[PDB]
Design a protein around this ligand. Structure first.
Ligand code: A1L3Z
Ligand code: MG
Length: 581
């Protein structure tokens, strides 16, 4: 028997640290934009081991871990530093619901950092998966028994010693300490829900729902496994009202009417239900639920300046930098309420945008931005240094998968390919590649071309400066809108709510909360009165929460304290948005 699972005191307590279930944490459906009623959540207490990197499966698993929290986190019950010379081993038993008899069974991982190998009942389930930010799945039907099944997963993660996408993760001793700067605790292992679902053999794996409200229609591509010879019926509805339906070919775009569309905006994030049914004749072979928000994003020349236009109209995108870090969970928010809290706070403070910083969150995060009405800018997580040929192939493969996994999100409107030159290469080529791969989103070739040795490819849709404290003097070009991809960074150490007392740093330390509030609102007023009329179209305020010793959140790292006067910040942001309109 392994050492029984043991909770670990968290470095800071969030409102939800003590709210995490033991046996079924993160219970919510993990893929809310492609749904079926039948599923089973495999989160909870697994047996666990740490071996050397090249070890095979251990004969004994001596410990237990709480999936899906990384080994570095307190919530995992392990809370240990994991190096490139280590490998994580997970094992649990599971039963298949008997009502799934006669269906295929898919085993789904939302994410696992970095290189994951999976065995079901001793048999490798499929190819090793490399990449810490993209979901992956195996068809495990043929490997199952009617009895107790065993699932074993190995996960190797070299963090920054590897050539792979890592973002802010660095190999760090886990106990709070000073002097880590803007890089934080690493995240190794399974960090998003693991689950099972039954499917017909021929089944939908992906929906690409592309709003075309100007043409009162939804562009749909139904994709999947074994269905390429079929038609598909796609229906758009709201409540009990059918809005439109069409039958078209699987794997090729076709349109479904959406007459008199109600548009998705941050102010009114209206969502329509969507159902997709691959058909043989009139026989439904599979059926998935989904949704869409009817919105477009593009560039246009407005009042003499290139501007990003939402549904054909310019609105200023006033956002925060959001790094997705948790003191208790590291990469994984302790509960769904915790995950969405950070986005709710954006809304409370009058922001209409979020830049998710060199991290891709789970699908439920995109669902929350979709529902709450925030524009999303998505960074591709960077590599730690210049890639060699294999590293480039791998990074591009990851990015392709991340793009393909988010095509239907209304919130997502912009891709940030690279950040401040980190691991930079092929700046112009990657901008064109991403735009061609997802032309209904904006593309940012490089964030912070004004600084840091970052090379501007010269293309993509935006010229993106990082200016601290800011807001600087970025102006659009004839071809590109001007954005402030980072600014602000105002620090304040809140006693009782410091990850490491006295450890905090920022781009400008404030002596008290009155100073922080005045200085913050002065930045937003500057943008409203001077920079936006001169061509600035978006700004990203660093940052939504403190992270480790970077104490420039609007919120403390534990989410316990809102440092700013919410009514004042909301009023400044709303004034900016209103003025832009
Ligand atoms: O750590 C957050 C922010 O202050 C950092 N500014 C420079 C980098 O682009 C960002 O990571
Ligand atoms: Mg990692």
């Amino acid at each position: 028997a392994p050492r029984a699972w043991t909770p670990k005191p968290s470095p800071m307590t969030t409102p939800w640290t003590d709210q995490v279930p033991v046996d079924n944490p993160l219970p919510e459906y993990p893929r809310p934009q492609l749904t079926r009623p039948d599923w089973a959540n495999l989160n909870g207490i697994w047996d666990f081991a740490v071996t050397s990197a090249n070890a095979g499966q251990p004969a004994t698993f001596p410990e237990q871990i709480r999936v899906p929290f990384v080994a570095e986190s307190a919530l995992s019950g392990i809370q240990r530093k994991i190096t490139q010379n280590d490998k994580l081993w997970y094992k649990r038993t599971f039963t298949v619901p008997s009502n799934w008899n006669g269906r295929r069974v898919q085993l789904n991982f939302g994410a696992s950092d970095w290189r994951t190998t999976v065995w079901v009942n001793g048999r490798q389930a499929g190819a090793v998966h490399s990449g810490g930010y993209d979901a992956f799945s195996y068809d495990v039907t043929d490997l199952l028994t009617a009895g107790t099944n065993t699932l074993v997963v190995s996960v190797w993660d070299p963090t920054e010693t590897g050539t792979q996408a890592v973002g802010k993760q660095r190999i760090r001793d886990v106990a709070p300490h000073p002097g880590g700067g803007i890089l934080y605790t690493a995240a190794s292992g399974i960090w998003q829900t693991v689950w099972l679902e039954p499917t017909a053999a021929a089944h939908v794996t992906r929906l690409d729902l592309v709003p075309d409200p100007a043409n009162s229609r939804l562009k749909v591509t139904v994709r999947g496994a074994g269905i390429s010879g079929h038609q598909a019926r796609v229906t758009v509805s709201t409540g009990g009202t059918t809005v439109g339906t069409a039958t078209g070919p699987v794997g090729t775009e076709f349109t479904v009417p959406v007459p008199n569309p109600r548009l998705w905006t941050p102010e009114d994030p209206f969502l329509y239900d969507v159902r997709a049914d691959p058909l043989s004749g009139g026989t439904t072979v599979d059926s998935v639920g989904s949704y869409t928000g009817m919105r477009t994003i593009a560039l246009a020349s407005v009042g003499g300046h290139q501007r990003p236009v939402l549904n054909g109209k310019f609105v200023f995108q006033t956002g925060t930098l959001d790094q997705g870090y948790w003191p208790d969970g590291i990469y994984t928010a302790p509960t769904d309420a915790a995950l969405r809290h950070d986005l709710q706070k954006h809304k409370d403070l009058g922001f209409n945008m979020v830049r998710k910083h060199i991290k891709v969150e789970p699908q439920r995060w995109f669902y929350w931005a979709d529902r709450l009405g925030l524009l999303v800018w998505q960074d591709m997580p960077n590599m730690e240094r210049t890639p060699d040929a294999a590293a480039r192939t791998q990074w591009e493969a990851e990015y392709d998968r991340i793009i393909d996994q988010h095509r239907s999100s209304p919130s997502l409107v912009l891709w940030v390919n690279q950040n401040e030159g980190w691991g930079q290469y092929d700046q112009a080529r990657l901008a064109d590649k991403v735009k061609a791969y997802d032309p209904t989103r904006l593309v940012d070739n490089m964030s912070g071309v004004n600084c840091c040795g970052a090379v501007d490819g010269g293309n993509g849709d935006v010229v993106d400066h990082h200016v601290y404290v800011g807001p600087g003097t970025t102006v659009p070009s004839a071809t590109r809108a001007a954005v402030l991809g980072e600014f602000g960074g105002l620090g304040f150490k809140v006693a009782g709510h410091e990850w490491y007392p006295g450890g905090g740093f920022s781009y400008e330390d404030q002596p008290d909360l009155a100073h922080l509030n005045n200085r913050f609102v002065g930045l937003i007023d500057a943008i409203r009165e001077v920079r936006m009329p001169r061509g600035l179209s978006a700004s990203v305020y660093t940052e939504i929460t403190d992270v480790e010793n970077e104490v420039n959140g609007l919120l403390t790292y534990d989410r316990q304290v809102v440092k700013v006067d919410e009514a004042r910040v909301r009023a400044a942001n709303r004034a900016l948005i209103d003025a832009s309109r």
